[PDB]
């Protein structure tokens, strides 16, 4: 009750008192205002000029409680808008928080970890500034224990979260040397048994692999792919989501990087992913498949072997539209790179009817994508002299009706592709 619901005016009076206990009491009152459920008065606290005082309190080794209260207050200011986070940084908080990482008081060290994560979480500039002030070494030192399970759960979760923010964002991506410095600790966190730590570790990995092939390679070379595939089969959606995100990112890389995903057994999980009740998981999984079918013929063959073509037919037939689009891309990629035999297999699995039904879409690019796939499939039928059987299959399911109509479509490319298909096969 003593420090509950103070006015900002009263907080200022206590902080300007030069009585350390009065200052502590007022800092706690500020912390409570900034910790309330609704609409913390962050701007009012900033406008009152309190940040420089809070920052000074961080350095009071002799009074650990005011260190904690001010770290908490500053954490919450930094949790706000970019302008609010900037106010904290502008007050000199970064080095002050880094100094607290070494505190003998675990709850203070943890609060500093948290504050630094909010700062880094603002964007690449503040992320990189936190790194330049030397945060990585002391952060990693806190996790340098024989067994992570000895750490307090909350403490470990906060450390993992802050590390993930240091891996986050691009333009630019985090410094290469910082990434190399963090990765081994991250790989270790990825093997921990706490669902929250696992989720954030997967998120960190997903950020690191969201980039050019060189960034992907740094992660893949650490040998984490098999563990990612294991997490891909997790029961918890908060783990599956970032695990799948990372796996998808990895397969945007070279064909060799993709093979690592296949070799680790990722494809066996796709029957479940491609029918997952969460729309986003189906979409991400189908996008991922589309990048796998963009690979080598031996990689398309593994998609075939794992029985995934019927699942792609399923998604084309019925799924959220965004997912059906990724499915269309998966098919066009498949038909572009596949062998005649692989392409023929596509038709036998029933690809043609759901492809035709999607020509009723108002999305211009997926019509292009679908028309491309049909061209590709026809090309394969040519080599077999079976073009006629395909033309009929397409007309029987109403596909010819759709294509002919697409000659008076206002997009140039579909105009051409349409007439050309008619001209050649109908």
């Amino acid at each position: 009750q003593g420090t509950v619901n103070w006015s900002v005016e009263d907080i200022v009076k206590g902080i300007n008192s030069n009585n350390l206990e009065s200052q502590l009491q007022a800092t706690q009152a500020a912390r409570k205002l900034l910790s309330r459920e609704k609409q913390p008065p962050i701007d009012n606290i900033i406008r009152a000029g309190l940040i420089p005082k809070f920052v000074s309190f961080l350095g009071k080794t002799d009074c650990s409680p005011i260190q904690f209260e001010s770290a908490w207050a500053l954490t919450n200011i930094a949790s706000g808008t970019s302008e609010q986070t900037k106010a904290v940084v502008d007050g000199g908080a970064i080095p002050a928080f880094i100094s607290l990482l070494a505190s003998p008081h675990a709850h203070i060290s943890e609060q500093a970890v948290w504050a630094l994560g909010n700062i880094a979480g603002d964007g690449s500039a503040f992320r990189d500034l936190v790194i330049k002030h030397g945060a990585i070494d002391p952060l990693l030192a806190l996790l340098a224990v024989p067994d992570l399970s000895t750490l307090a759960c909350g403490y470990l979760r906060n450390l993992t979260w802050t590390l993930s923010n240091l891996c986050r964002n691009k333009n630019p991506a985090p410094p290469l040397d910082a990434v190399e410095q963090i990765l081994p600790t991250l790989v270790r966190l990825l093997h921990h048994n706490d669902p929250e730590v696992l989720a954030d570790s997967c998120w960190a990995i997903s950020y690191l692999t969201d980039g050019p092939n060189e960034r992907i390679e740094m992660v893949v070379k650490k040998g984490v792919v098999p563990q990612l595939v294991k997490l891909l089969g997790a029961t918890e959606l908060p783990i599956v989501t970032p695990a799948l995100r990372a796996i998808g990112n990895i397969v945007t890389g070279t064909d060799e990087q993709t093979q690592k995903v296949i070799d680790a057994g990722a494809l066996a999980v796709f029957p479940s992913l491609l029918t997952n009740p969460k729309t986003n998981i189906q979409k991400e999984a189908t996008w991922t498949m589309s990048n796998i079918t963009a690979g080598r013929q031996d990689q398309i063959q593994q998609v075939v072997n794992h029985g995934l073509v019927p699942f792609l037919v399923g998604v084309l037939s019925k799924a959220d539209f965004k997912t059906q689009k990724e499915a269309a891309w998966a098919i066009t990629n498949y038909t572009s790179g596949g062998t005649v035999e692989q392409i023929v297999y596509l038709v036998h699995c029933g690809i043609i009817e759901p492809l035709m039904n999607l020509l009723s879409a108002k999305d211009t690019k997926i019509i292009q994508v679908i028309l491309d796939a049909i061209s590709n499939i026809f090309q394969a039928a040519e080599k077999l002299g079976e073009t006629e059987k395909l033309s009929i299959m397409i007309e029987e399911c109403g596909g010819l009706d759709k294509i002919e109509a697409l000659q008076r479509h206002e997009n140039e490319s579909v105009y051409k592709a349409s007439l050309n298909l008619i001209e050649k096969y109908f």
């Binding site: 954490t75 979260w161 998120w203 970032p242």
Partner: peptide
């Protein structure tokens, strides 16, 4: 024919910052 993530999409929707409301 690989397609990387579109520049207009976010990195997955996770909170960038966290406010501490309890101890």
């Amino acid at each position: 024919m690989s397609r990387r993530r579109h520049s207009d999409e976010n990195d997955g929707g996770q909170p960038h910052k966290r406010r501490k409301t309890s101890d």
